[PDB]
Amino acid sequence: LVPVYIYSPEYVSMCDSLAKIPKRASMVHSLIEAYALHKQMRIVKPKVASMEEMATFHTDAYLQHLQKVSQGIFDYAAAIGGATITAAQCLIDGMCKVAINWSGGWHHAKKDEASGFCYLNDAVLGILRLRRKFERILYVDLDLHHGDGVEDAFSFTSKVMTVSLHKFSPGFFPGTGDVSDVGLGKGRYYSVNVPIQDGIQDEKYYQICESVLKEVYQAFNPKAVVLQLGADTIAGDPMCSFNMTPVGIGKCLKYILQWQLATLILGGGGYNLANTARCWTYLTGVILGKTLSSEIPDHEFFTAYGPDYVLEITPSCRPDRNEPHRIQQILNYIKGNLKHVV
Ligand SMILES: N[C@H](Cc1ccc(Cl)cc1Cl)C(=O)N1Cc2ccccc2C1
Ligand SMILES: [K+]
Ligand SMILES: [K+]
Ligand SMILES: [Zn+2]
């Protein structure tokens, strides 16, 4: 029951050519490899998503339209979606308790519309596969942006709960995800949104996070978990909003791991290439429970980590815009919503 690591050379080489994240996949992979972490996980080759497999969420019209424009993104969408289905497949066959796909987590993609640079929602696809064996699924999103695509996917049902800790502020994409957003139908109060401001740091973040995941856990009682960990909340990132480091995110990760539920792990945003590699390696270490060394081990992209070549990331000098009073308002409101969840 060792963690499954969704990798093949062809999967990495492909993701390598994605837009604003060039070669990121191989940076992540080879840095992980450079910490000998691969040697501790079951390597599983990602299987390409079939047409029907994607159409489990996206319309045939959009899926066909995606072929046309990518005349390409469609093969991108097909690879990544398949990778996440594959990881979710491994969890259901029970060959692992943890399955990793760092190239997944494209949370903005809608049923028949692309947005937020997401042309296929692999998170949704994986949540659907898991449903084959797991009754209730908890989707937890810690990316910098609201996970509206995954939220929409399931917003009407109570069998899948989404919880999203994101930056919520005017002008900021997607402009949704206030605490007042709780879903609809039988699935009302089964969407959870945690609006957060700029400059927030590891400690305050993990307190807010743990606080909510404890309530949601008792209230929902999941059999599976899907965790998007977009690195675009880490200090130094071009998004320039939160003030987080991997230590804080790993604390949220480790907390969740305690549950020992089947857990599909996904990546996400993160336009700071070396920082994003630093983060998911650290986290991949957290999953393995093996503390890594502060010194980046020489490997193909060693120079990308200069000048100091360490794994730890430093917070920038900026204000924490989150007032303790507003945070408790947000939480108490969330706590109100959870009185309805059973
Ligand atoms: N998380 C979103 C979408 C995303 C982008 C790149 C990668 Cl590698 C993964 C994901 Cl899942 C995001 O980072 N956005 C940045 C941005 C800037 C302006 C408007 C929308 C978005 C979405
Ligand atoms: K989020
Ligand atoms: K829901
Ligand atoms: Zn993002």
Closest Cα to atom 5, ligand 1: which residue? 269
Q: Where are the alpha helices (DSSP H) in the chain?
A: 9-15, 24-33, 51-54, 60-69, 73-92, 122-130, 148-154, 202-220, 246-258, 273-288, 324-337
* CA nearest ligand 1 atom 3, residue: 116
Verify whether ligand 1 is closer than 6 Å to residue 129 (CB atom): no
93 CA → ligand 4 middle, Å: 30
Contacts (Cβ under 8 Å, ≥6 apart) of 124: 57, 109, 149, 150, 153, 154
23 CA to centre of ligand 2 in angstroms: 24
CA angle 139, 6, 133 (to 5 degrees): 45
What CA–CA distance (Å, rounded) separates 86 from 50? 12
- Length in residues, the chain: 342
- Technique used to solve these coordinates: X-ray
Q: Which of 210, 219, 87 is CA-nearest to residue 158?
A: 219
Q: Is the C-beta atom of 104 inside 6 A of ligand 1?
A: no
Domains observed in the chain: 1-342 (3.40.800.20)
Q: How far apart are CA 215 and CA 193, in angstroms?
A: 13
CB-based neighbours (< 5 A) of ligand 3, an ion: 154, 183, 187, 190-191
d(CA 25, CA 51): 24
- In ligand 1, the atom with minimum distance to the C-alpha of 103 is 8
Report yes or no: 268 and 283 within 8 Å, Cβ to Cβ. Answer: no
Catalytic residue among 108, 146, 299, 340: 108
Chain discontinuities in the chain, listed by preceding residue (C to N exceeding 2.5 Å): 71
Calpha distance 215→218 (Å, rounded): 5
Question: What resolution, expressed in A, was reported for this entry?
Answer: 2.7
Residue 117 Cβ contacting ligand 1 at under 6 Å:
yes
Based on the residue annotation, tell me whether 108 is a catalytic residue of this protein. yes
Say which amino acid occupies 143. Answer: D
Residue 21 Cβ inside 6 Å of ligand 1? The answer reads: yes
Query: What is the distance in A from the centroid of ligand 2 to the CA of 146?
Result: 4
The answer to whether the CB of 248 is under 6 A from ligand 1 is no
Encoding tokens for residue 222?
């999941």
